[PDB]
Write a protein that binds this ligand. Structure first.
Ligand code: CL
Ligand code: CL
Ligand code: CL
Lengths: 258, 258, 258
């Protein structure tokens, strides 16, 4: 008997498709999912799946992410659902999770092929930027008044690192920091990147206008030099996915194309 | 002749379906509406209905909510549209409105049945939690930097009350208060609940990360103990609906299941 | 050979339809577009179009807006794409752009007709309000804690001006200002208008509740008198469109109907 697997996020569902694995559950989402799962039961929001639906499906494994573990682990345990929280905070961690899914579900060849493809794409960006002069970068996540600083330990920080950017924040131990803006202004990043995950682009544009008028950020050289980018929310999520090669290539354009 | 009724919100439209009433107008919404109204004219945003469409429909009654009365009453009066603003700030108030709609539109039996079902569900939660030790709860509505404190006088406060939670805010007269965070930290709620009505879950997750880094909230015991929940926006609206029994059951899980 | 044109926003696509021009590219959007372009290739977000798709289409011209020029100009130049950034910061500027598109693409008669219709609608509002006593107005764009003041130099400021409103901000040179709220309170606008472009109405309602509790705004007479309006985001965009006649008529209702 094939294992009965519930995937609770779009990113995991895409990995399951590349691994040629059937699913009994998929997340409820407005995003397009692989066609093979067109008729699979939806199990609610990735950020809070519907435990009663999932229980009914009697799965052998429910797949979520490390970043959601604190939020969802108790509910799964309470419902007697076996669950695996995959670490998608870097591309490398995602690739190890892909390897481990191959081993867990008898798809070692498919996982190996997928990782080979990813690594080839990543290696090409690394090679492309290796001899370039590197810009310093400040990564912000959030909305006006509450921006978090994103370190190398989060996925968007990993993309900046792999594309050769030098994060203005160093030697930190957390994924997201509260912004110390006077310190950041003195550090003077060459480039500022912003992510408002899930937010409509029209709202993000409004935020862009606010940033330019704000004493808090307007005297940064990056603002004066028009080196502030909004990361396409549709392509740059908070955690890793198969979108990474495309995301890394877009990152390379922003860091060096100007 | 049947009365010509315009329902301007999803919640009211669902009540009209349970009352077996025809409609000449429904709100414009991306949410699924009862199938019987598939071909009914849409009348614009619940938060600002299209008065020119509604006028054309020559309704006998337009139904909105108390919470929107201040915003919409003048427009309706100016357009010579008769309108009823239903109080959905508690389940009990919603049930009285259901009774009154039954009387107004000759659906007393249907309203009585609907209220019987609701009351049976509510009574079961009350019975379930009656002998449990009760946690203190802080309810926040909004986005980083501008969270409102939600009292017992608003619908989400009513759900907390009915599920046995003790609001840290007492003896207030308003539905929403400005947050006095130092006071709230000293009150030390066992649990913090957050609602960002209408906001995509992916954005809410981002807010969750910001909350944990913010000096303003991070030293609350509830944060240290991982007792902060985001209320599923799709299920917990700002005002009451037929979703209430499901919402109350989910509330009971959060307050006691941990 | 007909020119190969890519329209990167909904507003421009609607103008191209009125000008009876074929398109090779349209923006990717959830909004309804003119039916004649049902099968036209989508080219990504208006706020960051997909340059690789657009390159493939080998267009003669890519159309965007002045307000996006700073963000998008370098990418287009880098991709060797000819691009025109149309000034939609007022109705009059939009009408000059319509005239110039007619000349550029051999649609002078169609552009002239479209502008005649627009001007007739605008003239009617101007005539309607000419002898009315004019209210002072404060226009805010954004979200709690980060509202920008909108001047006459931005499109929503232009609508207020044309409908007879007197902006409390005068003799400015920029489209958007940081809010000096103590100054604004002393200026005491008769009416406050708010725009959260792209934001779901349910979120905007939540913001409305927050505004009323905020010491920063609650002592304005406009708040005390219930003269604060949320501009329907679906109809009042950040920059001009063919929606303007409808928008101007709704503006006239808010400024004088009360
Ligand atoms: Cl993760
Ligand atoms: Cl209400
Ligand atoms: Cl513009």
């Amino acid at each position: 008997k094939e294992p009965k697997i519930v995937a609770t996020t779009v990113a995991i569902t895409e990995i399951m498709d590349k691994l040629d694995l059937p699913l009994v559950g998929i997340p409820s989402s407005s995003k397009k999912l692989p066609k093979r799962y067109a008729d699979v039961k939806e199990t609610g929001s990735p950020m809070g799946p519907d435990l009663e639906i999932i229980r009914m499906l009697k799965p052998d494994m429910v797949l979520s992410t490390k970043t959601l573990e604190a939020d969802l682990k108790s509910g799964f345990e309470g419902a007697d659902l076996e669950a695996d929280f995959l670490d998608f905070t870097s591309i490398a961690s995602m690739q190890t999770e892909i390897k481990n899914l191959g081993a867990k579900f008898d798809r070692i060849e498919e996982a190996t092929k997928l990782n080979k493809d990813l690594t080839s794409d990543i290696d090409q960006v690394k090679s492309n930027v290796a001899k370039k002069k590197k810009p310093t970068v400040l990564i912000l996540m959030g909305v006006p008044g509450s921006y978090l600083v994103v370190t190398e330990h989060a996925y968007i920080g990993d993309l900046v690192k792999l594309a050769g950017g030098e994060n203005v924040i160093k030697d930190q131990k957390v994924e997201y920091l509260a912004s110390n803006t006077e310190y950041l202004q003195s550090a003077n990043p060459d480039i500022i990147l912003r992510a408002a995950h899930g937010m409509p682009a029209e709202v993000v544009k409004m935020f862009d206008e606010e940033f330019k008028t704000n004493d808090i950020w307007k005297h940064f050289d990056a603002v004066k030099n028009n080196r502030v980018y909004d990361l396409d929310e549709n392509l740059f999520g908070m955690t890793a996915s198969l979108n990474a090669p495309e995301a890394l290539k877009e990152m390379e354009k922003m860091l060096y194309d100007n």
